[PDB]
Amino acid sequence: KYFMSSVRRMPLNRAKALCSELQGTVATPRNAEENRAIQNVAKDVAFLGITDQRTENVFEDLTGNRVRYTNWNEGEPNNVGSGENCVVLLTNGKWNDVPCSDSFLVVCEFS
Amino acid sequence: KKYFMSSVRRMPLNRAKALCSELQGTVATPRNAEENRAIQNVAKDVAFLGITDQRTENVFEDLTGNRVRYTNWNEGEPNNVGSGENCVVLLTNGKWNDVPCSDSFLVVCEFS
Ligand SMILES: OC[C@H]1O[C@H](O)[C@@H](O)[C@@H](O)[C@@H]1O
Ligand SMILES: OC[C@H]1O[C@H](O)[C@@H](O)[C@@H](O)[C@@H]1O
Ligand SMILES: [Ca+2]
Ligand SMILES: [Ca+2]
Ligand SMILES: [Ca+2]
Ligand SMILES: [Ca+2]
Ligand SMILES: [Cl-]
Numbered sequence: 001k002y003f004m005s006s007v008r009r010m011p012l013n014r015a016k017a018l019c020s021e022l023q024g025t026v027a028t029p030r031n032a033e034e035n036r037a038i039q040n041v042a043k044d045v046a047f048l049g050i051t052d053q054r055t056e057n058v059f060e061d062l063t064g065n066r067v068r069y070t071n072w073n074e075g076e077p078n079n080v081g082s083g084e085n086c087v088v089l090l091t092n093g094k095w096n097d098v099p100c101s102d103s104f105l106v107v108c109e110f111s
Numbered sequence: 112k113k114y115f116m117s118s119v120r121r122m123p124l125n126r127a128k129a130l131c132s133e134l135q136g137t138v139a140t141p142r143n144a145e146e147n148r149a150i151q152n153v154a155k156d157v158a159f160l161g162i163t164d165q166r167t168e169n170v171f172e173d174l175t176g177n178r179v180r181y182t183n184w185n186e187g188e189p190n191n192v193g194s195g196e197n198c199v200v201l202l203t204n205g206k207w208n209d210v211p212c213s214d215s216f217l218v219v220c221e222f223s
């Protein structure tokens with residue numbers, strides 16, 4: 001897997017479209033090593049290819065596969081307010097669930 | 112090493128540049144036959160390369176203004192047809208053709 005980060009921020013729909021344009025997908029760390037690699041390529045908070053849109057509190061990748069490895073920041077996921085169904089990687093490498101309509105950098109994943 | 116990825120949609124060069132740079136890469140510029148073949152492997156149809164003779168006609172440089180050495184022009188090219196062809200695409204046989212920068216083609220991005 002190869003990881004590339006975007007320079008501008010955008011909502012998840014646009015993030016997905018960007019990675020897909022070059023035939024990749026939004027980055028999904030499957031272990032601590034990939035998590036670190038993604039963190040390093042990201043210069044700020046960035047979207048991961050994980051969501052609990054289909055079923056609340058059931059996080060899966062963009063292809064429907066339930067994720068096994070997680071690295072939730074203390075207190076997360078909390079689905080605050082009207083809801084948070086997307087996921088971002090913070091600058092310390094931990095994850096936080098956020099509204100999919102909010103804008104962050106995106107890290108794309110390629111094989 | 113360099114990694115190459117092809118786009119799914121077609122677009123003019125300026126847009127191709129914007130796409131590749133959005134992920135901090137550049138439009139693919141093969142520096143030898145091996146890289147040219149690697150770009151061929153990912154491009155399913157005619158695609159833009161990061162080469163132009165926009166500065167001086169018939170003097171081809173990569174997008175950073177660096178004059179290229181290796182070229183793989185299709186027979187009869189570059190011919191700068193009509194009002195001008197200052198951009199370059201990789202044909203499906205691996206050979207190159209100069210085309211209008213305003214015409215749309217797939218784009219192959221390059222990363223390292
Ligand atoms: O207090 C943490 C809390 O801060 C904000 O409300 C958002 O970033 C939430 O996603 C996060 O859980
Ligand atoms: O005949 C070859 C000629 O065909 C078209 O006119 C264009 O694709 C040109 O760029 C190319 O040189
Ligand atoms: Ca949720
Ligand atoms: Ca949260
Ligand atoms: Ca020309
Ligand atoms: Ca031509
Ligand atoms: Cl949401």
